[PDB]
């Protein structure tokens, strides 16, 4: 098991103290490109950002 667990580095609780600890810690613990700013920017007809910003935004998933 490669999950990252909680670890009590120091001391031992009794089972009741462990139950309190864990209950407390547990109790504490779609694209919509419409009007994206990149559409609002004004580009030169030859601006490379039409590739590297605009398409790289609209196409990106």
């Amino acid at each position: 098991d490669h999950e990252a667990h909680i670890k009590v580095l120091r001391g031992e609780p009794t089972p009741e103290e462990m139950a309190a600890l864990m209950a407390v810690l547990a109790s504490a613990g779609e694209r919509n490109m419409w009007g994206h700013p990149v559409d609002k920017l004004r580009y030169s007809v030859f601006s490379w950002q039409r590739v590297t910003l605009l398409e790289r935004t609209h196409m990106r998933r």
Partner: peptide, 22 residues
């Protein structure tokens, strides 16, 4: 459900089955 959370305490594995959703 139950959330069986493994804890290590000084190296002892100790599953605590908490109530699931909370």
């Amino acid at each position: 459900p139950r959330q069986t959370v493994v804890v290590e305490v000084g190296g002892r594995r100790l599953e605590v089955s908490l109530p699931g959703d909370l």
